[PDB]
């Protein structure tokens, strides 16, 4: 067994291709050796080494012992790999890094940082007598007994969480202590406050060890809630302030609405008012508020300006994960365009402080952003999409674009730019002028058959590379790459028409717009692009482009997508390069309103090209004076507030819209051009009415618990079976579930990688991928373990989508726990689950005194109150819906519902004592409702919570003594409507 492996290592000890043998021998109980080698790309030799070592390792692992397996992992794991720089300890930031003029004597006082650290203070004196390294003085900040608590990132409302902690005792002698918890209102604890924070149960920590701490809580309210933890000992008392983040059930869904304010109609029709209506979505989680933020910025570029200049973050595409070099470049896109606006238009006076210091800061942030991409650069000055992966023509072109634009304000290394350009034109430009891709990275999915898809992708890549080379040409103006530009421009000229998609037509048009704008074929291409224009209005208020050609698809999209904004952006930039000012105003209005709070758009490419279009347009047209009185108010409610927008301040902070009324943004006679964006955030219980571009399936298994999450691509119309483009599999983990990071590492780090990048961020396992197949399923498999105990575990979500087409997606719910049944909660240890949901009255309870049934109905808090008959039961995810018939109405405070119309009720599934039987009648009285627009009519849905009075109501009178029961019931029912309390 040892020799059988000594031969393997010795065979590949000095082989050039040695790792392929190594990660070939790695364990993979889910795929055969040939299936794993089928993904190998690093060449033919690597496939055979991988296959050999895989087969031999699998044969040796038959009926092994744990010691034999581990010893084998020792033999392989040492001779073949090299090394990797990494560290197991964190070191805090240093401090006191200052210089002082010491007149022979100077004392300075401060406060030691909050840390358990042996600090080392070092002084170095400089004078006309030379240098003096003082004796290093030590200062150990140390605590001998202290508590720490592990609070999870988020917790779903209703979940019973076990909060784990530890008290550390570094003293050599044990001691007594007690930890107590601070009761906050929304956080339901099983015990009760004494005087008001928990109870002190005295325990003992042994010397030089620790003791465990646990607190079970159940959040009833959503949001960030402060919880304190007190550690008391005979030598003192410490308070640890903590915060629990409570998240709603279901999926977060975010919609956007945009409005442009042109009070004098300079760029189009006058636009002084707009009404953002309050509309409740269909599957809204009950007892959750519809959040929506309002952002009113000063210019077309105002949103990006606020994004960069306000340093509270910020990524304009937070919904997209990091990992690709594209993300690192996109990080510098907004800062660049802000700098380009401020410098080209000379608008540095916007700052009330020193503009030179602000230009300094932006220059520094631009450089800081510029170092981020250095990691993705190879020795030959090519760039790789994935760190350590193969160099990509596509990404090298994009880096050349961003760097080439940035060089204007932060000069770039000419020798580096030259080597990158030459790596492009010397190796990956074909005789016909097109460019070919080296790596397997598929940034975009195009239509057509395999040959037609090939032509389309070749055209796209050639135009993209041409844009990059044009944007970076002035840094290294070589005749060789200009000749390359001529050949590529020729390929574009001859092969663009007849077009196969508006997308490739637009990008080819913009690439050619960067060169000779007088070639006849270019003019033909621009005409064909104009022919596909869509307009809203006549005379058009908006002008935009659909990415599909008209002769292939005549339907007009109702909402924008990334390809729509990107095609429109390329066409806009082409028109700006042609100085076609009459044609762009409705396009600018459309791109401006399609923008999003934060400055970004749908994906990455559309964002950068749209930002460039808006910015270049803003610099090309006259800068108008800015002066508006912008009033935002609710329709049937008070005025929210109003501000006077001027050039002094116009990047005002956003404002949250709390009230449930329709919003109205209006302005009088003004000068300028403002933007008004509203982001609506809701939480939904279902995903059925959403278009799924992926078949998804996900399960948890027991292994000899592991998550297996599979996806498969659903090709659109006329799309080939080759699979998707760059994809993302985002798996939200349930509360308290932790993923095995070794399994994920093993799935990306090897030559047989299944995924191209992974990360764990905020309870999400985010994997990225070059392509998800259409023919079959692709599955990520990784082990999971339970970090802390969670009761009433809320399901999590599994989302996969195309990185550059977030509209091609599919979201599915799953739970890691099988746990049923939910029969009953048994007495006490119960008030927290049944806290915020209804309790059914005692069946045929004759003690209810008819006047207590009326005073409860006439309560001003109780909005509605009437008698219904249940028609259907339904269980949807985490809630239960009851279809009932509205029989007799007894009260209506708010909107009205029709008699004998269908009424829906909803209760949290985790509520047992409100069990309703189909077909029985009930008297139901409660607060509030939801008014939805379904099909073409209204619908009302009523949640079942606390203070919702429900009672079983038989129709006949053969219930023995309940004859009298219905007597008093019909007494109340008779008295309520004849009075009007």
């Amino acid at each position: 067994l040892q020799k059988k492996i000594e031969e393997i290592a010795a065979k590949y000890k000095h082989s050039v291709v040695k790792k392929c043998c190594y990660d070939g021998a790695c364990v993979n109980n889910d795929e055969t050796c040939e299936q794993r080698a089928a993904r190998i790309s690093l060449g033919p030799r690597c496939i055979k080494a991988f296959t050999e070592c895989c087969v031999v390792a699998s044969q040796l692992r038959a009926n092994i012992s744990h010691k034999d397996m581990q010893l084998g992992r020792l033999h392989m794991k040492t001779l073949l790999p090299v090394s990797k720089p990494e560290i197991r300890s964190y070191f805090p930031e240093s401090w006191l890094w200052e210089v002082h003029l010491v007149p022979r004597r100077k004392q300075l006082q401060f406060a030691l940082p909050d840390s358990l650290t042996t600090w080392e203070i070092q002084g170095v004196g400089i004078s006309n007598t030379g240098i003096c390294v003082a004796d290093t003085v030590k200062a150990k900040v140390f605590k001998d007994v202290f508590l720490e608590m592990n609070i999870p990132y988020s917790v779903v409302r209703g979940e019973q969480i076990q909060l784990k902690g530890t008290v550390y005792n570094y003293r050599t002698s044990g001691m007594q202590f007690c930890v107590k918890m601070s009761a906050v209102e929304g956080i339901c604890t099983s015990e009760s406050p004494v005087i008001k924070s928990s109870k002190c149960v005295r325990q003992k920590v042994e010397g030089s060890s620790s003791h465990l701490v646990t607190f079970t809580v159940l959040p009833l309210e959503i949001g960030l809630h402060n919880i304190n933890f007190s550690l008391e000992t005979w030598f003192g008392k410490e308070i640890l302030v903590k915060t629990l983040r409570v998240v709603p059930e279901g999926v977060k869904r975010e919609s956007y609405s945009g409005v442009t304010l042109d009070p004098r109609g300079i760029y189009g029709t006058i636009s002084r008012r707009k009404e953002f209506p309050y509309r409740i979505p269909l599957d809204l989680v009950p007892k959750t508020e519809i959040k929506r933020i309002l952002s009113v910025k000063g210019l077309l570029v105002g949103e990006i300006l606020s994004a960069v200049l306000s340093q509270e973050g910020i990524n304009i595409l937070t919904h997209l994960p990091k990992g690709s070099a594209e993300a690192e470049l996109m990080s510098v896109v907004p800062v660049f365009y802000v700098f380009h606006y401020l410098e080209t238009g000379n608008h540095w006076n916007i700052f009330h402080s020193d503009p030179l210091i602000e230009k300094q800061k932006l220059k520094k942030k631009l450089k800081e952003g510029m170092l981020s991409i250095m990691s993705y650069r190879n020795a030959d000055y090519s760039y790789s999409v994935w760190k350590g992966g193969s160099a990509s023509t596509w990404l090298t072109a994009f880096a050349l674009r961003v760097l080439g634009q940035v060089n204007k304000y932060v000069e770039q290394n000419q020798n580096s730019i030259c080597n990158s350009l030459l790596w492009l034109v010397e190796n990956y430009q074909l005789d016909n002028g097109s460019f070919k891709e080296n790596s397997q990275y598929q940034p975009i999915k195009l239509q057509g058959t395999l040959p037609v898809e090939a032509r389309e992708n070749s055209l796209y890549l050639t135009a993209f590379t041409v844009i990059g080379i044009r944007k970076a040409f002035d840094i290294c103006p070589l005749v060789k790459i200009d000749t390359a530009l001529i050949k590529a421009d020729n390929f574009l000229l001859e092969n663009t028409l007849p077009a196969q998609s508006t997308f490739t037509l637009a990008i080819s048009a913009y690439a050619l717009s960067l060169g000779d704008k007088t070639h006849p074929q270019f003019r033909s291409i621009v005409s064909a692009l104009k022919r596909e224009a869509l307009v809203k209005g006549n005379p058009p208020i908006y002008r935009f482009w659909k990415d599909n050609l008209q002769h292939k698809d005549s339907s007009v999209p109702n909402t924008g997508t990334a390809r729509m904004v990107e095609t429109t952006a390329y066409a806009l930039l082409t028109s700006l390069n042609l100085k076609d000012i009459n044609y762009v105003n409705p396009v600018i209005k459309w791109l401006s309103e399609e923008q999003r709070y934060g400055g970004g758009f749908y994906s990455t490419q559309d964002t950068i090209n749209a930002i460039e279009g808006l910015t270049e347009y803003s610099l090309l047209v006259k800068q108008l004076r800015l002066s508006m009185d912008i009033d935002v108010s609710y329709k049937h409610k008070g005025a929210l507030h109003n501000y006077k927008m001027t050039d002094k301040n116009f990047l005002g902070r956003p404002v949250e819209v709390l009230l449930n009324d329709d919003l109205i943004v209006s302005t009088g006679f003004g000068s300028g051009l403002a933007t008004v964006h509203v982001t609506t955030v809701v939480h939904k219980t279902s995903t059925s009415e959403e278009v799924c571009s992926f078949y998804l399936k996900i399960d948890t298994q027991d292994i000899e618990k592991r998550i297996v999450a599979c996806a498969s691509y659903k090709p659109s119309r006329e799309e080939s079976s080759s699979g998707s483009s760059h994809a993302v599999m985002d798996i939200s983990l349930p509360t308290g579930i932790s993923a095995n990071e070794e399994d994920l590492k093993a799935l990306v780090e090897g030559v047989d990688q299944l995924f191209t990048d992974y990360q764990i961020k905020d309870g999400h396992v985010i994997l990225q991928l070059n392509s998800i197949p259409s023919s079959d399923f692709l599955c990520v498999r990784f082990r999971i373990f339970e970090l802390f105990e969670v009761g009433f575990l809320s399901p999590a979500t599994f989302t996969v989508y195309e990185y550059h087409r977030p509209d091609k997606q599919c979201t599915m719910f799953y739970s890691t726990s099988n746990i049923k049944i939910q029969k009953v909660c048994e007495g006490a240890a119960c008030k927290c689950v049944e806290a915020d949901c209804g309790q059914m009255q005692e069946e045929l309870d004759l003690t209810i005194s008819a006047e207590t049934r009326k005073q409860t109905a006439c309560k001003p808090e109780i909005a509605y109150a009437y008698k219904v008959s249940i028609t259907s039961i339904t269980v949807e995810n985490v809630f239960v819906k009851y279809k009932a018939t509205l029989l007799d109405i007894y009260k209506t405070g708010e909107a009205v519902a029709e008699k004998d119309s269908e009424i829906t009720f909803i209760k949290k599934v985790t509520c047992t004592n409100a069990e309703l039987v189909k077909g029985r009648q009930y008297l139901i009285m409660g607060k509030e409702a939801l008014q939805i627009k379904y099909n073409f009519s209204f619908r009302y849905i009523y949640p079942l919570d606390s203070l919702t009075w429900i009672e079983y109501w038989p129709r006949d009178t053969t219930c023995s003594s309940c004859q009298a029961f219905l007597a008093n019931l019909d007494e109340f029912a008779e008295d309520i409507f004849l009075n009007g309390c």
């Binding site: 020795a379 030959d380 020798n415 580096s416 030259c418 080597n419 103006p477 070589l478 005749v479 060789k480």
Partner: protein, 49 residues
């Protein structure tokens, strides 16, 4: 033709400066290899107008 195939070279004088030579006029030197090595060699590229 001119800077078609002539190597160029970057070197260090006793003062620490970097200098490039081997490259005829009207051309640019493109140097391969880690930019921190003082002694680098590359080739000349014809440059444009």
């Amino acid at each position: 033709d001119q800077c078609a195939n002539v190597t160029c070279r970057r070197t260090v004088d006793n003062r620490g400066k970097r200098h490039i030579d081997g490259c005829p006029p009207g051309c640019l030197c493109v140097l391969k290899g880690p930019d921190s090595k003082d002694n680098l060699d590359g080739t000349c590229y014809l440059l444009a107008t």
